[PDB]
Structures are given as structure tokens and as C-alpha cells.
Scaffold this active site. Structure first.
Site, short mmCIF file in Angstrom:
data_model
loop_
_atom_site.label_atom_id
_atom_site.label_comp_id
_atom_site.label_asym_id
_atom_site.label_seq_id
_atom_site.Cartn_x
_atom_site.Cartn_y
_atom_site.Cartn_z
N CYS A 121 0.81 -1.16 0.00
CA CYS A 121 -0.13 -0.05 -0.16
C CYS A 121 0.64 1.28 -0.20
O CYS A 121 1.45 1.64 0.83
CB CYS A 121 -0.96 -0.18 1.08
SG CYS A 121 -2.02 1.55 1.30
N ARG A 138 -0.05 4.67 2.75
CA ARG A 138 -0.17 4.28 4.18
C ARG A 138 0.29 5.97 5.03
O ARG A 138 0.20 5.78 6.04
CB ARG A 138 0.94 3.36 4.44
CG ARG A 138 0.24 2.05 4.16
CD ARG A 138 1.26 0.81 4.68
NE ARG A 138 2.39 0.80 3.58
CZ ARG A 138 3.40 0.05 3.49
NH1 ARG A 138 3.87 -0.47 4.90
NH2 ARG A 138 4.33 -0.05 2.81
N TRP A 162 -9.21 6.30 -1.20
CA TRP A 162 -9.55 6.96 -2.61
C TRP A 162 -8.58 6.55 -3.52
O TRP A 162 -7.44 5.91 -3.16
CB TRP A 162 -9.53 8.48 -2.25
CG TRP A 162 -8.15 9.09 -1.61
CD1 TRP A 162 -7.06 9.36 -2.11
CD2 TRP A 162 -8.25 9.18 -0.55
NE1 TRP A 162 -6.10 10.07 -1.28
CE2 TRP A 162 -6.86 9.86 -0.18
CE3 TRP A 162 -8.93 9.28 0.90
CZ2 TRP A 162 -6.36 10.45 1.23
CZ3 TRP A 162 -8.43 9.87 2.05
CH2 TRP A 162 -7.30 10.47 2.10
N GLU A 183 -4.64 3.58 -11.11
CA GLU A 183 -5.30 2.42 -11.11
C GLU A 183 -6.48 2.48 -11.91
O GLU A 183 -6.51 1.39 -12.77
CB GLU A 183 -6.12 2.66 -9.41
CG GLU A 183 -5.04 2.66 -8.36
CD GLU A 183 -5.70 2.48 -6.80
OE1 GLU A 183 -6.33 1.37 -6.61
OE2 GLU A 183 -5.82 3.48 -6.12
#
Ligand code: HEM
Ligand code: HEM
Ligand SMILES: Cc1cc(N)nc(C[C@@H]2CNC[C@@H]2OCCNCC(F)(F)c2ccccc2)c1
Ligand SMILES: Cc1cc(N)nc(C[C@@H]2CNC[C@@H]2OCCNCC(F)(F)c2ccccc2)c1
Ligand SMILES: C[C@H](O)[C@H](O)[C@H]1CNc2nc(N)[nH]c(=O)c2N1
Ligand SMILES: C[C@H](O)[C@H](O)[C@H]1CNc2nc(N)[nH]c(=O)c2N1
Ligand SMILES: [Zn+2]
Lengths: 411, 409
Positions: free
Chosen positions: A108, A111, A280, A285
Site C-alpha cells: 500500500c 499508508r 480513495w 489504478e
């Protein structure tokens, strides 16, 4: 022991001690690295050490390690495990646990945000209808009319593994995919199998390119039940381009709320098999993966056609040119509609600052380079040049198999 | 123990059995993955099993495993190690070993080419002057007026380790870097230290932005000596853009021949500390890394300005737009000048085909995804979606530390 990581752009060297707290295995050995492999019930016996390790971490975090309250809680959990074979987390422990699973999530890049997480405790949920209501409330809260807020909803833990809560959807919001008789796909080819399941379960499919899927929810190990998210709760963004007026007529849109719903949250040896969480989007992506993967909406050709790029040879870098314009469009569209989104430059720069902070204050930050480096423009982001150590800390999020493979149909 | 790799785009699953022959350590453990870390003599006793393992694979490759000639050569090499403390490879074994070091190079996307490698045996070389001649000839052969040919030149093997042959340069052809009186850097910032070593050894620096560095050659463990590659052997390409007339005014050029000169080639336990090799560029190496790394020529800002992009916010993707144009210009310039180059789409497509071949004919292909995936447009190339297993096979190329740390003068 001390492990060092270097940044090859800045020559900053960081020292990791946190990896010493890692227990679980990576998939790698001294002879083989599995760093690019996507996928590399507990007894009383195994459970109390896991509970103790967690409670020790929790009590240290609140500066009460070794206190009477700490010792009393160890005793309480010990007695609960011996007698009922499991135990229940305090609300404070659950919150701390969910925050830390995110903090520990090595794949991730988002973070820096980990300590700002709204935790919805849904451990009193007993039915699929109950799960539906909780998930609706999560969607509305997290969406916040475009001003997105990170959240997680946590349903009851595993007991004997025959009574699992599961969200069958991989994300709370996704579009349906329909395989046509001619072999083409309408909508999202990633969701074809799941769409077929929903139809079989009685969903009336609109059969368009962007149909929001219904929720398929399993409570207490029962057969899953279908529910449609109220359309007015599903915020979507039509995609347009700041300079190219033809971009809108591609007919593209995407949903604002990315919400992973298929992972397992482990806290103190307890297993939360249904724990949908949301943040979000980072723009890539959608613009790189969802739109441009050959396996997904696959729009590169059509976009480059409309840009009149030279498409007779890959060396004109037409794919790369179209890829950039599509990603500009996604970011522009979200920003113009006031829906939270972060570009890959901003996100990676914030990640590097997060990671350095973590090294100073925590002694490390496990990170999976293969996932953290964005899927376009890799080396013009600071993470490309940053060495990372990947290891597994708990609390944690883990991939679990899709429920349709393992579910015992009750009928 | 038998491992699967899946391509997530195509669903193709391949089974790797080759990793069980792997020998060296990765740097990873069951607790920690070091996949993104850049850097994660032999006695008679250590040398013979290494020799045997190599000769077994060699005799197997020419379908003469367990033959009298196989046993006879093992016997010969054994006697030679016991008596002389080392051994000499036959020309056939040297060629085979160098090709397989390339075949085994898990970070190399270009390995479809591995069997077409011209091997120049320079084991008879004894002086730095001899080294220079061999290297010029390599440079001329490999360049081939722009129609590049893969080649390696192999200097004498390590003995007691006090007589190492080394090319001090990291590549045969690279540009100088100089720290400027006002704190900026002129030329390639990556080469500042090496350039200082050249100047202090005698080099008369032109003090420009693209000065080809001299070679610093070390023979037989002697102190290295300086030689300038004949300017007419160094093919360079002026960088222009097919649409942007102003691009040429940046004054960019790069050299046509990429030639790594600082690695150690290990074959059958023998260590070739000077083994310069060359292929041809994948365009992103120059356009993305050499030109756009913040620590390298760092040109993104100047290009973006000339394109008149909104540089006020990261989210306009001005960096990304300028990046693509710079890479279009690199490829266009090489193509127009008839100098071999491969784009990242084409190179990665070939590597996937190569992986499939290696899986079917060899039982696997060691690959380092972190290096194989290009530094731009990762997921629109097929390697992004391909699981890879990384493991270390011999013969191999290994990074070695810069000799100016090792060397006693
Ligand atoms: C706040 C904004 C966030 C951003 C910008 C962000 C960004 C990302 C991105 C880009 C990925 C890789 C996704 C992919 O390639 O599929 C990722 C993965 C992941 N994120 Fe974050 N994230 C955010 C919030 C969160 C939250 C709230 C959680 C949990 C509480 C979380 C936990 C994870 C986990 C467990 C993964 C690995 C997912 C997997 O294995 O499929 N993230 N994140
Ligand atoms: C013929 C065309 C070739 C192409 C297109 C090619 C491509 C590449 C690329 C893009 C890299 C990564 C380079 C970097 O990022 O610094 C690489 C690495 C590497 N290549 Fe190949 N290569 C070719 C020829 C060769 C040859 C002839 C050899 C050996 C005989 C070789 C051995 C290696 C090794 C050992 C590495 C890792 C280098 C390092 O650790 O610095 N390559 N190659
Ligand atoms: C095989 C496998 C293993 C694994 N761990 N994970 C997967 C889901 C893949 C990962 N890569 C594409 C897809 O993941 C799809 C979901 N992407 C993340 C997100 F958009 F939902 C999101 C949620 C919350 C915050 C930010 C972003 C598959
Ligand atoms: C620290 C460290 C370790 C290691 N193994 N390697 C390095 C050289 C770095 C890697 N990345 C940039 C630079 O390498 C520069 C050389 N690049 C490869 C090439 F251009 F020379 C080439 C040769 C033959 C065929 C195609 C291309 C540094
Ligand atoms: C095979 C490879 O590990 C796989 O394609 C990975 C690469 N990196 C990724 N990185 C992110 N963030 N998300 C992904 O789905 C992937 N896919
Ligand atoms: C830290 C990270 O390992 C480092 O920046 C790597 C990433 N991938 C790379 N890939 C290639 N081909 N060459 C490189 O120099 C690097 N650098
Ligand atoms: Zn590893």
C-alpha cells in the site's frame, strides 16, 4: 541485527530493525526470490501466543506495558480462550488492530494516511440484510459527496470456519462483465465470473458497459444473498479530457469509491473474513490498469486512433502517448467533479516521506517494491529508486480464496 | 519444490524445475525479501566441484554425457587443478560458458539473443596496451557501422588475485562528469569520481558536456594505464524529434554501443575479472534513465518548458508527457541514423517469447522482475503481468566493486 536500504537517487541510507518482529514467511528462500509472485481454524495452543503478542504491542502503544490493566487483560483473554476457545477484542483493540493492519500493508502506497481511519464495528451483525445496511452506511460515510474519507467495516470473526461472514464481491463497487457468444466482452472482463454468479442468483442484468454489480453477502456461513446498493449512494465520474473534446464520447466513467471487500483481517490471531475497507483512488489504478490492461477495458487502440497517432510500429510510442492522455483525463475529471483522487507523483512522494518517518519512529516500513512502483512512468517517481524490505507484520490484511470455490451450499 | 509462474494477462501457467539446479544465495530469506536491493581466491578443494558441475553441464549440452571424452576431460581437469592449483578452459568450453552466463543473466531482457554472441578470446593478452587493442577491435566489430553485433572479450582469469585484469571503467563508452565552481555538475553526474581519477592519472579533460572518457586498463595486477578510444570508433547519435524542430537545440547526443565492462564472469569456478560485453540499447535506458533520472542528465524540466506544459501541478502529468517525447526522440534519432535500437514494447514481447522457449526447452528462466519491467509504461508491456522466479545459475556475470577501492598503488 540491522539491515540497510539505500536510495540510489539521494544516497540516503536507512536502517531497518523492525524486520526482527516479523514472524510469518515471505515465499522467498536463500535459493529463490518470489518477490513477483502475486500469491506466494486455530487451536487454543496457537492462539494465546498470538493474542499475547498483539496485547503486548497494544499496551506498549498506549504506554501501559506491564501495567495492572495490561496484566488483567492478558489474564482475562487467557481465561476466555481456555473456556470458549476464542476471545473478543475490546473496541479500542479492534481500532488499533485495523489501523495497524493498514500500517503493515507492504503493498500500500497510501499508508501516510494510516492513522486516519474510521472503524465501523459491525461485530453485532447477524444476517445478510444486516450486512447490507452496514455496507450502505459505510459507502455513504466514506463517499461524503466526493470528499472521501477512509473507512473499514468489521463483521464478526471466524469461529469454526463453518460460520464465516464473507462479502463475495472483490470490491463493494464494480462493473459487471458479460462474455458474448462471439467471444467479445461487454463491460469489465475481470468481473465476468462473478457477474455470472449474480445472474444465477437472480440478478436482472441491464447488460451495458458500466452496470454497478449487486452485493452478494454471506452471513454466519449461510448461502449468500443479493442486494442492490441504492444508485444514489454510488458516486460516479464521467471521464472527459481538458484539451480533447472527443474524449467524452468514448462514453467512459468510473466510480469514485475504491473499496476492497475480499481480504481477511488478522488481529491477535482472530480472523475477520469480512472487513471491507475503502480509501480513495490513485489515478493510475483507473487510467493505467482498469482502462488500459489488455485484460480489462482495453481502450488504448481506440484512444490512439482518435489522437491520429502513428500506429504501424510500436516504436512511435503511440501506446505510451495515449496512456498519458487517458491518465490526464481521469485526474482532470475527478478534480473537476471534486472527487478525491491522488496522482502517482504526489502519492509516491508522500509515501517516501511516510517511509522515512516510519524508519525513524518505528525502525522500519515493510514495502513491496513490485506493487508500490506505479504502473506507468516508474522511474520518474522517487519510489523506483528506493530500496525496500518486504516482510510480514501482524495485524495484517491477507488475500483469501474466492468464496464460490469453498462454500458449502446449504440449498 | 516444483514451482508455477502465472501470467495474469493471459492465464498461461508455466512450471519451473530449473531453479532446483540453482546454487548461489539470493539475499532473501523466509522472513525478508530483498528483491529490490541492488546489491543483496578459490582453493583446490572448492575449485574441483565447480569445474565438474560446469563440465557435466557442458558435456550434457553436446549430448556426450558420461562418454569417454567426458570422463577423460574431467580426469584432465582434476590432474591440472591438483598440480597447478587452477585449470584452463578449452575454446569450446569458454564460448559455451560465456553464452550461458548471458543466458543465466536474470536481469537481462535481451536474452532471446543469447546464443548469438561473438566471443573474443583475449586470454593471451599480457599488457594494458594489448588490452586496449583488443577493446578497440571489440568496439569496431560490435558497432559494425551501426548494425550492432553482440560480443564479449575475455581477458586472462584470476590467479592468486594479485594479478587481476580489470577495466576500471563501468562501461567502455561513457561521458565525463565535472563538479563546477558554482555547485552544479557539467556532463554525466554519475561519472564525477571516475573522471577525477582519470585527470589525476594524467587525462587532459576537454571539460565539456559529452566528453568520451578514456579507458583505464589494469593488466596482470599492475597499476592501470590510460588510453583514448580512437574518436572514429565511437559512434554517437545526435538526438532530434520527428515533430519538435526545437528538440535538436537542446544539444543532446548519446553513444550507440552499450558495453558493460565492470562485471566478473565466472565459468566452472574460474573467474574472469575483465570481460567487457556489449549488445544494443533498449531506448528507455537512454531516454528514461540517462536523460531523466534526477541524478543523471536530468532534462525533464527543460523539455517540459520547451513544450509549454502546465508545470505548476504534478497532476497535469507534465513530467509524463515530456518523458514520452524524450523517448520518442531517442528512438527516432537512432532509427534515422541506422543504429540498432529496440523499443521497450518490442524487447519485452521478445523476452516473453524467450521465457516460453526456456520453460519448454530448459525447465525455466531465472528473471528479476524489478529490472526486467521497463522504467516507463510498466503495465502496458507484457512482462509486468508475468510472474518471474529469480534465482542464480552458473556460469554467471556478477557485479564487482570499483577497483580504486581494491587497488594498492
Ligand atoms: C487513503 C487512500 C489510499 C490510497 C491512495 C491507497 C493506494 C493503494 C494502491 C494504489 C494500492 C495497490 C492497489 C492495486 O494495485 O490493486 C493499495 C493496496 C492496498 N491497500 Fe491502500 N490505499 C489507500 C487506503 C487504504 C486503506 C484505508 C486500507 C485499509 C485500511 C488500505 C490497504 C491496502 C491493502 C491491504 C493493499 C493490498 C491489496 C491487495 O493485496 O489486493 N489502503 N493501496
Ligand atoms: C543484444 C541486445 C541486449 C539487450 C537489448 C539487452 C538489454 C538489457 C537491459 C535493458 C538491461 C538492464 C540494464 C540496466 O538497466 O542497466 C540488461 C542487463 C544486463 N544484461 Fe543485457 N542486453 C543485451 C545484450 C547483453 C549481452 C550481450 C550480455 C552478456 C554477454 C548481457 C548481459 C546482461 C547483464 C549481466 C545485465 C545486468 C547488468 C547489471 O547488473 O548491471 N546483455 N540487458
Ligand atoms: C491475485 C490477487 C492478489 C491480491 N492480493 N490482490 C488482488 C486484487 C488485484 C490487485 N491489483 C488489481 C486488483 O485489485 C483491485 C482493487 N484495487 C484496490 C482498490 F482500488 F480497490 C483500492 C481500495 C482501497 C484503497 C485504494 C485502492 C489479486
Ligand atoms: C549498483 C549497480 C549494480 C549492478 N549490478 N549494476 C549497476 C549498473 C547500473 C544498473 N543500471 C544503470 C547502470 O547500468 C549502466 C549500464 N547499463 C546497461 C548497458 F547499457 F550497458 C547495456 C549493456 C549491454 C546491453 C544493453 C545495455 C549498478
Ligand atoms: C506478476 C506481477 O507481480 C503482477 O502483475 C503485479 C505487478 N505489480 C502490481 N502492482 C500493483 N499495485 N497492483 C498489481 O496488481 C500488480 N500486479
Ligand atoms: C532500488 C531499485 O532496485 C533500483 O532503482 C532498480 C529498479 N529497477 C531497475 N531496473 C533496471 N533495468 N535497471 C536499474 O538500474 C534498476 N534500478
Ligand atoms: Zn525475495
Amino acid at each position: 541485527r540491522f539491515l540497510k536500504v539505500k536510495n540510489w537517487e539521494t544516497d540516503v541510507v536507512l536502517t531497518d530493525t523492525l524486520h526482527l518482529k516479523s514472524t510469518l514467511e515471505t515465499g522467498c528462500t536463500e535459493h529463490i526470490c518470489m518477490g513477483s509472485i502475486m500469491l506466494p481454524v486455530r487451536t487454543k495452543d496457537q492462539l494465546f501466543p498470538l493474542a499475547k503478542e498483539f496485547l503486548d504491542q497494544y499496551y506498549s502503544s498506549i504506554k501501559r506495558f506491564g501495567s495492572k490493566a495490561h496484566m488483567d487483560r492478558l489474564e482475562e483473554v487467557n481465561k476466555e480462550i481456555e473456556s470458549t476457545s476464542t476471545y473478543q477484542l475490546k473496541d479500542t483493540e479492534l481500532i488499533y488492530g485495523a489501523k495497524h493492519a493498514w500500517r503493515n500493508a507492504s503493498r500500500c502506497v497510501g499508508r501516510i494516511q494510516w492513522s486516519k481511519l474510521q472503524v465501523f464495528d459491525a461485530r453485532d451483525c447477524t444476517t445478510a440484510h444486516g450486512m447490507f445496511n452496514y455496507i450502505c452506511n459505510h459507502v455513504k460515510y466514506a463517499t461524503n459527496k466526493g470528499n472521501l474519507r477512509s473507512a473499514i467495516t468489521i463483521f464478526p470473526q471466524r469461529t469454526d470456519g463453518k460460520h464465516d461472514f464473507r462479502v463475495w464481491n472483490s470490491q463493494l463497487i464494480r462493473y459487471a462483465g458479460y462474455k458474448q457468444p462471439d467471444g467479445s466482452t461487454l463491460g469489465d472482463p475481470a468481473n465476468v465470473q462473478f457477474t455470472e454468479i449474480c445472474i444465477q442468483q437472480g440478478w436482472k442484468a441491464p447488460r451495458g458497459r458500466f452496470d454497478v454489480l449487486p452485493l452478494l453477502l454471506q452471513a454466519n456461513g449461510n448461502d449468500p444473498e443479493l442486494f442492490q446498493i441504492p444508485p444514489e449512494l454510488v458516486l460516479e465520474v464521467p471521464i472527459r479530457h481538458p484539451k480533447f473534446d472527443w474524449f467524452k464520447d468514448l462514453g467512459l466513467k468510473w466510480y469514485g469509491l475504491p473499496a476492497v471487500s475480499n481480504m481477511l483481517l488478522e488481529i491477535g490471531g482472530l480472523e475477520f473474513s469480512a472487513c471491507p475497507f475503502s480509501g480513495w483512488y490513485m489515478g493510475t489504478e483507473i487510467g493505467v490498469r482498469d482502462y488500459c490492461d489488455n485484460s480489462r477495458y482495453n481502450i488504448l487502440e481506440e484512444v490512439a486512433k482518435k489522437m491520429d497517432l502513428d500506429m504501424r510500429k510500436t516504436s512511435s510510442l503511440w501506446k505510451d502517448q495515449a496512456l498519458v492522455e487517458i491518465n490526464i483525463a481521469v485526474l482532470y475529471s475527478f478534480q473537476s467533479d471534486k472527487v478525491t483522487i491522488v496522482d502517482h507523483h504526489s502519492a509516491t512522494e508522500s509515501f517516501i516521506k511516510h517511509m522515512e518517518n516510519e524508519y525513524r519512529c518505528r525502525g522500519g516500513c515493510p514495502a513491496d517494491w513490485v506493487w508500490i512502483v506505479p504502473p506507468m512512468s516508474g522511474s520518474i517517481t522517487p519510489v523506483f529508486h528506493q530500496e525496500m524490505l518486504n516482510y510480514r507484520l501482524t495485524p495484517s490484511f491477507e488475500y483469501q480464496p474466492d468464496p464460490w470455490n469453498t462454500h458449502v451450499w446449504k440449498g
